[PDB]
Design a binder for this molecule. Structure first.
Ligand SMILES: [Mg+2]
Lengths: 144, 144, 144, 144, 144, 144, 144
RNA sequence: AAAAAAAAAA
RNA sequence: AAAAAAAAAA
RNA sequence: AAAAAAAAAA
RNA sequence: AAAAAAAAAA
RNA sequence: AAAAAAAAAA
RNA sequence: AAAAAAAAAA
RNA sequence: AAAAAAAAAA
RNA sequence: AAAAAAAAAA
RNA sequence: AAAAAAAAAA
RNA sequence: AAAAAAAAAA
RNA sequence: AAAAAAAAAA
RNA sequence: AAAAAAAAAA
RNA sequence: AAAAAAAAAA
RNA sequence: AAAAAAAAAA
């Protein structure tokens, strides 16, 4: 291959965009109480910690959740997700349970194309229920 | 295709990275004086205006330059690029000229693999000369 | 085939969901006045009569309508449907007419993928007009 | 694909059913005492928690069971299932044991076609034995 | 081919619609001031000048823009487009620049299927920025 | 498919037309006396009710007619169409009759290419005769 | 194709005929009394209402008949045709009956080649019988 | 499956 | 015969 | 797709 | 042999 | 079926 | 390469 | 894709 | 059409 | 050449 | 997919 | 990749 | 191996 | 030779 | 015979 700088024969000025979209997998944790649902706010996805603080909207594609701390004594971990939407909340309760007490439970759901509109910081993604005090989420989304 | 949320059968917690790399084409302008070379600082690529203020290093891959304002009366636009590098500056003067007084002049150079190390805000990309008072740059780079 | 119970060699505890989605064709009637349009509420679709009282949202896919009573003397039955949407109402008036006075008139419309968002009880599906005093609807939808 | 509503050329009024059947996998737990068998009532499957409170009969196809709490000290989890039938109870004791003390034990059984009649709330599905204080069941059935 | 009127053997009365949908490319102009973004209202698309005054909703599919007057002295024309959405505004700034001072600058963007819902007169399509005092827009859209 | 807005690399300003042509099937009704021909005016086709009030000309391609009310006692419906043209009226009498007293009569005629000139609101399409007091027309035409 | 008049290189004066033959399907109605046969006169086919008043002879090829008014209460329509010929009358009674009280009855017969001689106004085609007071006839014939 | 009108593309 | 939902399986 | 009547053509 | 108009057919 | 002049096209 | 108009030809 | 100048190689 | 980054899949 | 909307057809 | 035990069949 | 339930379709 | 976003190429 | 129940296997 | 740098070309 080349070992020196070489000339590019550029032409006209291209179409440009200083502030493009970005397809991402955002990891973050939320704290949960026993037997009480926690609504996950979209605003959690806008943070300098993720290089995403310059965005104001995001299109969520899929949501996956793991338990992040150990469960109560005698119990296996579990986590439930209930999808939420601005045009109408769901009542599905997708649930995963561990089969080894020392292991995370996990579950996720995919959002269909007809429901992939933008959300803003004030919106919510889903409700989380778990017998563990922390749940780790990984959300796949397109920032725009 | 599906019209409702569906279950994902997630497994172990994956490898994650909250602060990933980003391949970009960054557009910005600089002011140049007649007969005086202008050193383009790498720090210009780190700005909230480009969603890149969270990075501190970047690997520049190629530089393209267009004249941005009209040339002096009776002349055609021209722009020159001289590559700069921390381990040793170049003396090439890649030059483009307009063939129509009303049109931009353009030129670019590609940086070879063996010279694609990181730069930081205090470093310089290249020297620009032009008979126009502004030059528009589009730099292809990998933020990391 | 087997005539007795046989063992299943079950494995880890699976992903579960106690409240799944349901793809349905719901049949109900509405009362129509002459010359006056009737707005069909989405809330009609949530009812123990359909096994759907546990849902709060629904994604409507297609609407079909039939006249359910005889037309006025000398007339042939007709029915019109005007689609309604929360992001903006349509002005189409899909219309079916009977070619035999003793026969139902019918018409339907399909909602495109890009408009299949959720609707809740307070929302409306469409407007119905008819010269018959009742209209029977069958709505294809996904409860979620 | 289409971006707007389009007409459907509906025909005669179709055959309809407002209360269809539903093929389901229902997950619930039961409390078990040491040394004592627990009869699992069919009535557990009818509940608003499963969107099934509108059904009065169900045809059970297969039963699967997992231990839901940790076993006694020094022991590995186990669970046994004895199938029950209105025309005559079985004496099989399908049994699963854990090979890791921290792991659920599991077992299931399939009901043959010739024994898939309806069962109502007063009937029983099976007997459960376990050295763990709770057992999680998933039952595959057709509500009708 | 035939030179006279001939008979059609028509059948039963068909499904009809007196107010159908219309796929269109609407051309119009907006006035913009330097350094100020102009929000383009959807209501611009409803006008007798386009035969569209009888619609109240539209699904926007793509937006293209051109500069419509000459740029300031010594400058090349430019135009930026920032998409707007009811469910959440974007921060992209799609930009095109002229390479001959006597030529229009142009740029455009396409709206994805998941974001093609309806918009009414009070909604906005996008923000426009330019150094030219007028910008010509051509919007591909579906009136319904 | 794509889930976010993407750039279009627009070129030169295209050819545009804010007021285009429209191929339509227009349904309307006319009142008829027994034994008396009714001349159907072309102006019926220009109406806000059809989104056509901005057109002043139209090219009729085909005419189809149905009886719209029940026939006199003891009779079967019938309907006759006689084409009219500015350059010379026809004397054809295309006729349809019902074979069931409860059923619409219908007939149609196609206009040949050499006769597809423009007509204006003061022109006439055809003559209608029927033993029913109302006739329903569906005209296929091109508005220009 | 050509858009202007063009020359024909005509030759010798051709064979001509100002009064050609005409294959036609003539529709007309006759009045019938209960229990009485009606002889259909051939003269009914020579009329300005059919553009045939310039013919004095006709060759009848086939005869079809429909009932034209409702039958008496409780009865289904029927119609009978008995062919008549100048060289000798038939005694067949081709009959058709309705299977729905509201629909027309119909029947017809074909005249074989050996019997297709000319007929004039004073001749008869056939005898009609019917329990309906009017019968509609369509006769396929060659005017010469 | 072919065609006309409007839209969009390689 | 293809595709979407819930269930079951090699 | 075949046949009759009228028209036109290689 | 191909086409238009009227008629008839599988 | 080939060619020239004017027009129009993929 | 196909077509229209004028011309010319086997 | 072919050629010249400089460099490197099987 | 090939390659790099992020995302997603059999 | 493929697709959407309106129209027409075997 | 092959085999042993019990059952059943062309 | 095959089969059962509810939905939709050529 | 197929797809989306950003980049680059024939 | 195909199938059901129990057992054993690549 | 393949490649890099500079030049020139279809
Ligand atoms: Mg009937």
């Amino acid at each position: 291959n080349s070992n020196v700088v070489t000339m590019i024969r550029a032409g006209s000025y291209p179409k440009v965009n200083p502030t493009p979209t970005w397809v991402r997998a955002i990891p973050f944790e939320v704290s949960v109480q026993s037997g009480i649902a926690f609504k996950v706010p979209v605003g959690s996805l806008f943070s300098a910690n993720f290089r995403t603080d310059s965005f104001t909207s995001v299109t969520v594609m899929s949501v996956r959740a793991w338990t992040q701390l150990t469960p109560p004594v005698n119990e296996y971990s579990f986590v439930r997700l209930k999808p939420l939407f601005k045009t109408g909340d769901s009542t599905e309760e997708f649930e995963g349970r561990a089969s080894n007490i020392n292991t995370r439970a996990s579950v996720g759901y995919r959002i269909p194309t007809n429901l992939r509109q933008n959300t803003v910081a004030a919106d919510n993604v889903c409700e989380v229920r778990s017998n563990c005090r922390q749940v780790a989420l990984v959300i796949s989304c397109c920032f725009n």
